[PDB]
Write a protein that binds this DNA or RNA. Structure first.
Lengths: 114, 132, 62, 185
RNA sequence: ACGAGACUCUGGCAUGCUAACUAGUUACGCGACCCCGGUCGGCGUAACUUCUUAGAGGGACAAGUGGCGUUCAGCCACCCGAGAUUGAGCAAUAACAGGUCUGUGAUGCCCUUAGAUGUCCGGGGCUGCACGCGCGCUACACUGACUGGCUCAGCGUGUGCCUACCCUACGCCGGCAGGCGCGGGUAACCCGUUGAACCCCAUUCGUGAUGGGGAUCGGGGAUUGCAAUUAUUCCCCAUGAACGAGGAAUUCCCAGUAAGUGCGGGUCAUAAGCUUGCGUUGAUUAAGUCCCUGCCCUUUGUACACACCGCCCGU
RNA sequence: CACAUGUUCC
């Protein structure tokens, strides 16, 4: 249960994820029910962006001793094209363009042509 | 309760440290500037970011600000920090010398000088603070 | 014992156990020189006069 | 008439405000004139937006009491408008002047409070709050289970309050509260 | 790095933009009626987007001034202004033996599995009543009850793949519940211009357990269903009880807010005192404090750690 | 001015 949970945590970083919250609930090693929690990277919880930045999937696995819960939560990366993730930028990120390298004039000159 | 956070303030300094000439003083002026020189996602933030810029402009015209990298003030600070007066703070004709530090030079090499006149000793040792 | 016109001229702070009283530096329209401190109930404004049924009771500064 | 106002048929002018302690908290003349004792509202939002309200509208704002009659300003104005003539047909003078001596004479000066009680002075706005209140619940029992209607009891008390004749509820509760404060003063 | 913020939907202002024979207006032209004018959801027409509706945008930022503040973060005040805090949603780290195996073809494990704790059919019970408790409703009257008149809304839903079961106008019959015949609505169309109450005006009662109250209970009549007796509901008549402002105690709340007043949704064959929303009437009070109740930082004390609901001493 | 006590398999 430890080895396999990294097997999906690394599979997205080779695929280019922004962050993930994987939590394996249910009983592990005994009668008591516990919860695994391997969080990493950027991952938000609040706001309207949770609908289109994070895709949530929850599943159950059938075994002989109990039913374990898995929440495979991934935070989608951003792309202005919109083919890997949402088109809309973050609500807090401020994309400021750099100033263009213009050299200030000291001489009054004309460029009439035609 | 209207206190701005980092994204209102860390961004507004990037508006100033890179675009100083492209702004003015009025809010709606550089509100209409900051929409094209910065991709702000929302409208309410667009009024938020520029609102701190005009308030800091009310400071830059009035004095120097710490977290600001403006090309025109530092060159003004440059010319006062490469400053050299035509006379030095060392080229003095009357070098008043204490009677005891007169004695230290007589044993050294430069003992007899020209522009060094000697003062009078202070009477009575009274130099430290009364305790209490 | 006189009814006196005591003009509230500035507020100090809210007092009492539940914060139901406020203490004011009150001044007298009847003579400008003497002025005392005295608790007031209800919402207080600036520059209003009060009606003291007694004039010799002074409140302590918290 | 764009120059003067008539409160139904009652004149705006000739109401001298006796007490100088409350005249900054009685909005009744030349800046505060309305034909009705009814506006859209809006007076009860700010801290001191209660100071410039017309006093006759304030009493109707305090009359709609005890459940069933809350949210029924349409009829309490029908009570005081009837009650204003009752004052006039007993006095002959301005009935609104009787209200001026009513709120002046029914506001307690000193008031004990939980501090052991310390008797302390009150605000003029607190004083106009209580003076308008103690009569407003006093007539609330005078018409309660009685042939005397609510229009008369509203008119009967401030008549008995403008002279301080001590047969109204508001006068009795003012001097007892000034005296039980005088105990721990 | 998360949470807070930002963000979303809604609320308010833009006679500017885009257009509406299933939205409205403005005219013009008749019809009707009164003395050219007046009125009409009577009837057509071309111009319009004011109202209709919703699309884009635009609008508020502590922006401007004045105090105050390191003159920084900011706060108080004014003016211009439709706004100088609309409301909710979302909402972390860690945690509880919180609850649900009665939501499941989500399930480990256990009991049962034909004379079945599986399944269906009949009927009963879950409504049962010495008693205590919780959320409620209508009341205790004259600011009222009762009877005429007048007049105002805003949220929704409606013909079901099964499904055989809809929302309803109109025309009659009957005091009513209700019933019969036609027509339209799969809906901005028909219902519906949703003629709501409260209300307002004017009677009548007159401090009386009274014309306040409608509990109990008898008699008759209709709907739904195969079936209503333990009265499914519903109307009519008669019965008219407790209750006279609620002790000790305690709940909720600060702006269209409390409360009053109704209207839709859900459950629904029959069906709202509940609940979820809507509009309508419209405040008193307050712009404060840690007193209480708790809560968050910092120091400090700790013999506590299932953690003060702890621990522990002597007879 | 008064305000004592504790039930604990987990």
């Amino acid at each position: 249960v430890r080895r396999a949970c990294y097997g999906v945590l690394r599979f997205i970083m080779e695929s280019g994820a922004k962050g993930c919250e994987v939590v394996v609930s249910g009983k592990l090693r005994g009668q008591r029910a516990k919860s695994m929690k391997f969080v990493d990277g950027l991952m938000i919880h609040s706001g309207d962006p949770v609908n289109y930045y994070v895709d949530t999937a929850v599943r159950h696995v059938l075994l002989r001793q109990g039913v374990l819960g898995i929440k495979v939560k991934i935070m989608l990366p951003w792309d202005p094209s919109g083919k890997i993730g949402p088109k809309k930028p973050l609500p807090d990120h401020v994309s400021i363009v750099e100033p263009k390298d213009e050299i200030l004039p000291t001489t009054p000159i004309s460029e009439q042509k035609g | 309760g209207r206190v701005r956070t980092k994204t209102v303030k860390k961004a507004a300094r990037v508006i100033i440290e890179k675009y100083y000439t492209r702004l003015g003083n009025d809010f709606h002026t550089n509100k209409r500037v900051c929409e094209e020189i910065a991709i702000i996602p929302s409208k309410k933030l667009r009024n938020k970011i520029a609102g701190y810029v005009t308030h800091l402009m009310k400071r830059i015209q009035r004095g120097p600000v710490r977290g600001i990298s403006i090309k025109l003030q530092e060159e003004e600070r440059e010319r006062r920090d490469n400053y050299v007066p035509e006379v030095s703070a060392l080229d003095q004709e009357i070098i008043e010398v204490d009677p005891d530090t007169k004695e230290m030079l007589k044993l050294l090499d430069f003992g007899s000088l020209s522009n060094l006149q000697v003062t009078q000793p202070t009477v009575g040792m009274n130099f430290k603070t009364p305790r209490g | 014992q006189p009814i006196k016109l005591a003009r509230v001229t500035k507020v100090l702070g809210r007092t009492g156990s539940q914060g139901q009283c406020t203490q004011v530096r009150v001044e007298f329209m009847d003579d400008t020189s003497r002025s005392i401190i005295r608790n007031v109930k209800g919402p207080v404004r600036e520059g209003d006069v009060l009606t003291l049924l007694e004039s010799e009771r002074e409140a302590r500064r918290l | 008439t764009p120059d003067i106002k008539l409160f139904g048929k009652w004149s705006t002018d000739d109401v001298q405000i006796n007490d100088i302690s409350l005249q900054d908290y009685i909005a009744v003349k030349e800046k505060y004139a309305k034909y009705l004792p009814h506006s859209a509202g809006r007076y009860a939002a700010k801290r001191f937006r209660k100071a410039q309200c017309p006093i006759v509208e304030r009493l109707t704002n305090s009359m709609m009491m005890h459940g069933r009659n809350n949210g029924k300003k349409l009829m309490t104005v029908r009570i005081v408008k009837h009650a204003f003539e009752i004052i006039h047909l007993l006095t002959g003078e301005n009935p609104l002047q009787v209200l001026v001596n009513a709120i002046i004479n029914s506001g307690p000066r000193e008031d004990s409070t939980r501090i052991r009680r310390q008797a302390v002075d009150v605000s003029p706005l607190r004083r106009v709050n209580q003076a308008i209140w103690l009569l407003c619940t006093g007539a609330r029992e005078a018409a309660f289970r009685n042939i005397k209607t609510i229009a008369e009891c509203l008119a009967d008390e401030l008549i008995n309050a403008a002279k301080g004749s001590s047969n109204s509820y508001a006068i009795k509760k003012k001097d007892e509260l000034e005296r039980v404060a005088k105990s721990n003063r």
